[PDB]
Design a binder for this molecule. Sequence first.
Ligand SMILES: O=c1ccc2cc(O[C@@H]3O[C@H](CO)[C@@H](O)[C@H](O)[C@H]3O)c(O)cc2o1
Ligand SMILES: [Ca+2]
Lengths: 703, 706
Amino acid sequence: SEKYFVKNGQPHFLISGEVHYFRINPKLWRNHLQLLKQTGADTVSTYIPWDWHEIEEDDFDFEGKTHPARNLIRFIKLCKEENLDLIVKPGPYILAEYENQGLPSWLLKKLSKNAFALDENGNVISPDLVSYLSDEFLEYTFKWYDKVMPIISKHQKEHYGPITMMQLCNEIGVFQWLSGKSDYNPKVINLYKEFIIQRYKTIEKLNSVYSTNYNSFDDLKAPSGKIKLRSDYCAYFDFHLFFREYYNKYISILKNKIRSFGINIKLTHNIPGWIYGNASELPMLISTYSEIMKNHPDIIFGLDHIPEFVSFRNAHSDLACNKILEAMQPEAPVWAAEFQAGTREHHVKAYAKDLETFYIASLAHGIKGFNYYMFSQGINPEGKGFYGKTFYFQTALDAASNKLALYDSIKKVNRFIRKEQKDLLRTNVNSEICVGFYKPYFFTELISSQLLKEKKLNVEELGLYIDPRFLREEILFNGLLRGLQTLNYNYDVVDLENCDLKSLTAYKQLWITSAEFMDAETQNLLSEFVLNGGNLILYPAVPTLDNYLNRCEILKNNFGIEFITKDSSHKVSAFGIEDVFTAFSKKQIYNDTNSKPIAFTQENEICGIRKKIGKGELTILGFAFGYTSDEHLELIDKLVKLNKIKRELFVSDKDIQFVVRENNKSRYIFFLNYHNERKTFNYRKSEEISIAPFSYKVIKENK
Amino acid sequence: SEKYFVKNGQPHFLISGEVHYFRINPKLWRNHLQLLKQTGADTVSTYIPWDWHEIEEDDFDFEGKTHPARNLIRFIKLCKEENLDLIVKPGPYILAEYENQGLPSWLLKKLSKNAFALDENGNVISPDLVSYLSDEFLEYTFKWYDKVMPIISKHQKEHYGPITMMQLCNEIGVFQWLSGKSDYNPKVINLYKEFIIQRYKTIEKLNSVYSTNYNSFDDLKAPSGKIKLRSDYCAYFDFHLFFREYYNKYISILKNKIRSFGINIKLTHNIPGWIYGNASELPMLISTYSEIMKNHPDIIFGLDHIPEFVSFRNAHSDLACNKILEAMQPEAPVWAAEFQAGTREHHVKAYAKDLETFYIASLAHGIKGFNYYMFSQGINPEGKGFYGKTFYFQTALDAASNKLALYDSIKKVNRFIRKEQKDLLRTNVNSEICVGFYKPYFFTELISSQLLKEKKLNVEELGLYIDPRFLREEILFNGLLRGLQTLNYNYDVVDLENCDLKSLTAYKQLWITSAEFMDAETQNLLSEFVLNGGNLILYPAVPTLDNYLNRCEILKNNFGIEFITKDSSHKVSAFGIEDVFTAFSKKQIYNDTNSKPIAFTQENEICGIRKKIGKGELTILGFAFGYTSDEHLELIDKLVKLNKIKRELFVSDKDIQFVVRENNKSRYIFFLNYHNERKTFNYRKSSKSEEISIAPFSYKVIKENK
Ligand SMILES: O=c1ccc2cc(O[C@@H]3O[C@H](CO)[C@@H](O)[C@H](O)[C@H]3O)c(O)cc2o1
Ligand SMILES: [Ca+2]
């Protein structure tokens, strides 16, 4: 049942370290590789920067003719001699704080205007930022591929070489995220128009969905500025769909070109989204790759985990991210393409004793492999660094291969992992709770994000009150998922799109965090789930609209629900818990015919009910709670206990986190202390131990 | 010349703990007070909530007639019996996670729409957010003061009662700030128009400053919407000046009212600004009090410190904030009206081991008194909790008066303070560095802040490139102040407004973080400073405009500087440090006339120079750096060393922070480890070496008898 990497026909925990040959004294390349191998790592990972090797137009140095650190061939030879497998990342974009994000200076200098990403007035957004589908950009990308891909093809694992995986480009769409700006290049806007025509077929069909009054597709303009009308929301929704298709077209073009060289190894891509040590935005970035993950089951996405510290402030971020990637990519191991080792930023400290705890927590939270980023510090060669001379700090090795404090922490965790990987990789948690991932609530990188300065989405202007980013960040990510983890209840996440009914029926509860809109397909799925015997928990809204904010009340009518939306005090009572703080004045007040009232406003109006529908059970709460009080944990606990779900252990200290992982034969109990307190506690199944601050203990049980 | 509190003509460390009588079983009041007293605390602090005591309109209970916990009189009497002095805070706002932020439900239901803070469209910003100078709001506030102020007056120290201090309202402007919108109530609009007419006298004079073409004052309205023209910036600048007069008017009205009851005790106010465990916007909020602090020498402002954790991530916020309070309030002790104890929110943990280090760090960083907030947990009665039933967590005492882990940390810190206060309160750090606090860079709460919904200020639209909020957050607060503290260089902060030349001349260096604009008075002061023998470090810009973005080239002309603004790579070299990352493409390029060039762009153009001018020294850097790379610390270290400024100690681990405080008798060495690493290091005075082991997120204090 578990997905994991394999080596010598056994489960293999992928332990990779990032070592940028182009940023390291070549005399010390062998020393870095030997010190990496000596931690128990099996793989090394690096960019092959286009700028670094195509030194002028059609002048390629991969052999150190012009600088010894351009000798990629020798670095590959060294990986073979030191028995490390190799992950290569030739771009064209590599980011990695490399000048021009890895694109050559000579290329950016001579590309025409129409090869760049353009704002809505036709201005170049950034002198570094090309349009992914520019004919000029792809012509030169292909000329770089023509030189680097034969080297990669020769050394690929399919030819018994060291190269086991290759990453295509780097964090596709990351520049649209960080800026909030879409590419309005006329070639992108022409592709958008093809996508719309393809989708709706006739202007009359589009007009009926958008409530527009176009006489033809020729009157359709790309959306821009703030959303004022429901028709602007609709246009922006399809603009988000279009960019997911667009990224799939871009990665497909790169993939087909790579395959043309007989490169048959595993291809990868990498998911950004951590900011200031939390990852509540990362599911939005995952959502931008929905079409890639649909269309390319041979491309493994990995996570970019950047926790910065390890505490209760961010304990829930890595688990939520791991569970969501598993939802969206169930057929591949969950792995970290970039797994924090040291720090990108000198002033943002990464302590060995914090990261060691993060690495063990990552095992507890289901990670199957990772690439320490950065294992080795780098020195930017002559003016190639976008920032200072130094690339990363507090790594395992400095740029001169001096061992730093993190080295011994990585050796200790790698030793544990190698000892256990055969059993540990084959263990799972027993989840009786399933949490729905409704991808359309996440499709907002152009209109509403933590990085977007000025919000283009203001739902009040559309006659709505539940903002999908507030819901997915505060009610879902920082609320339910944080609460379940804190309470030590296992959950799984499931992608609701084209979702198997049979795959929901394993779980004793399905939790849906719902806004006022939800497509017919998901409303029908949830209707069938309950009617066939499923237990659904749904809040803060029974949806009444589809993704285009057109009437859709399938779930409401199937469940015999009637409500009025009414203003009350933020505080409600729910299952006899008084003073539950809720996010909104506006609540759904339910007709209680054939229902049990279980929640009440300050004026005693019914804002939550339970009822039987066919063979199943429904719990609807017409109010939004996250986790910002002890009453919120008490409510999540009451709701889980409605279907008699139990924790795997009794632990005497409720602030100790545990994860029980098992298979037929083996059990691992991971105890995690996310607090600045020495804790002493005991445990028993549904026995006394001391854990230092910000630390861990792993217990093995034979079954 | 330290500022500290005095009791019986002796130095006295103010130690208060916050104990909310209205959230504690009255049968347990005495036990809370005794346990606070047993920590060596001398004072207890509480709100008196309007909503709690005016139970219906004109129905008052301070005696526990309708609920035992309304017996304010008994609580006051117990404070006296248990030998604690008492800070009272009767509002009208208390915030304090109390329903409607302390305002009665019956009041907010009764008030007409014009009692409320209104947005640009005339809509109510929040149903518990009043407009401060609303006629209706102040009428009911006065009727609340009519009943609570005679009790406070009767129980003052001078009448042998326990009351020594009273807070006026609570964090003026904090609710407006968190709302993300400013108040456009018609009272604000009308008071603004009067302010503009008083300021400019004629529409011609206003048109000449703004470059507008108004026919009369009747054509001008309070500015709304984004700044697109320099005239819109001018309008908003006067709107910011107006709001400082407005907050002074509010607190003057409360103060004059309080004084009419024969209340002669010390009045206080409390400074907000911490959010998510840093305080980079606190200087903006304290800036909104500029007119209060000039007009009321008898109101002492204290800080509300909420660090939430204690690490290098937020190490610099408390020192910066303490230094900025001292700059604005130089004649009163630096103290914390609210000093974090436990956590206001269950999901944001407050660890005893963190807060104990915060308490010692605060002493290192010159705090002279504090009120542990919250010393005692509360339970909200009768649904009064804004966010839940429980008020605070991981406090010194739970609501029942059981000791929690933090109790022992507070007893340890208090014991050290009581043993040492007579010397400690009289100690100084030796600061050879002065950093200028230019208040108008902070006057952006209407147009640019971390909390404001709308970005109204885009300097590029104005032909500018140095955003004042970017400068003051990243180049000053998180940049220079963070770097000096990390490098263990003592600094003082000095308010440049009406600044005495003589108060700047004691320092070896004066550091000015400058935008492209600065008023004539400040340009002149910095000119005179250097000409008379001061050493000035100025970056990232020689200013050329005044506060209204009109021509002012006084400092440029007085220092004999010629420059062109030119685009280049973000990276410069400075004093032989290569690949120093700077915030802007645009840099000031200086010619080398009568100067030593000491920084260069990627094209080897001069973007930094040093020169002698009259008796003084000038170092200008035409580029912006904060602290986002090792090169920045190297650069700050080099600039400090230009005047042979030395650290107090040689310490073997550069990541150990230290503060040496001394007087004639006594030296205290504070070591602070803001890192998750057990550190073993040696040290020595810059005039054999001592070895120290320090736990993660921990401290040592050495005392020496001189
Ligand atoms: O609707 C409201 C009104 C007031 C209000 C005050 C609150 O507290 C303030 O929070 C600031 C930010 O962290 C601090 O700078 C300040 O010192 C605190 O007094 C709060 O948490 C929530 C609130 O919600
Ligand atoms: Ca019904």
